[PDB]
Design a protein around this ligand. Sequence first.
Ligand SMILES: [Ca+2]
Lengths: 140, 140, 140
Amino acid sequence: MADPSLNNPVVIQATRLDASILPRNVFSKSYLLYVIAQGTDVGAIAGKANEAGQGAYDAQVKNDEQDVELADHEARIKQLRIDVDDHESRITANTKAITALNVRVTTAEGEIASLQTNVSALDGRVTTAENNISALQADY
Amino acid sequence: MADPSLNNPVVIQATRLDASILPRNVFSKSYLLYVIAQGTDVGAIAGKANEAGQGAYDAQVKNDEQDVELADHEARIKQLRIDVDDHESRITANTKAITALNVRVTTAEGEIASLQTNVSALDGRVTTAENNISALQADY
Amino acid sequence: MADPSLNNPVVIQATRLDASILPRNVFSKSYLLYVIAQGTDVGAIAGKANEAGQGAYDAQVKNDEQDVELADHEARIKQLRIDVDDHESRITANTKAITALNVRVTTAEGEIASLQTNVSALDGRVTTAENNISALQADY
Ligand SMILES: [Ca+2]
């Protein structure tokens, strides 16, 4: 998790050099300019170090929130896997059930046709029988 | 892409400063105090730069692991997409199959009904015919 | 969003130290070695701070790209989630339809069976009728 110490800037405990206080007769000129320039530059690098700290810190907070989002996505994916596999099972079951039901209805129609033929035949024979009855009754 | 150099701190100086090693009849008060706090400040900025660098490094490592996790999530998600599309196909197929089977069962039942009514007709006419036969046989 | 200012290095006006610019008889050995070491090392700290800044920047841009990919993952996951829920619904519906169709077909077959028994009985009765009629003209 993001490290808050990166949010603490360094405050410069030194005071911006006054060019009155440097030793007069002991230093060369070039070295004087060197000390002053080094002071200013120390200030600047301090600033850069602080800003860098803040950049890395923000990178870390972003990484943390993205870690939460990644875990969430992972979980969602896993739930979705359970659901999809269950769905696979139930789909297969439904397809097989449809096919089996189809062979059953096929057999049913097969029986229906024969029943139709039989009922027609019985109808004809019954008609002939009725005619014979009427004929036998016609005489006495 | 990860830079290990960000995890390598710069080691400053060699020897620490107390005003012992300082000349100190040559330096004024303000400049003496300036040398010391500046020493302290250089130490502090070294520390801040190092910690910031390390923080950025850790941010990069986290970026790497998150990249791996992102790739994993990508593969898993795309596969789930293909699977879900397959499920869509089979579901549609099953719905259409059910629709096709239902009208089939309907016509089968309609024909069963017609066969029922016809059978009832035959069963009445057959009963009446039996009555006529029995009457013809009775007289006699 | 990524801050490009982290890629802007501090340029240190001081390029440290020469044996020409330094005072001589005034400094102690330890203090001289301290000045030299301080010169080289402060520069080094500048370099490290700059490098750290660059690292933080790279971390931020990488975070941005990962944000785009994460958003993509979010959208895809939620969409496939609703789709999977839809599949759950229609699968359940299909299972219920299959069960209902099965309940219909069982009863239909039962009715077919009853029809077969009835048509067989009618067949026998019609045969008996044929024999009785045939017998009735047989004796005339
Ligand atoms: Ca990241």
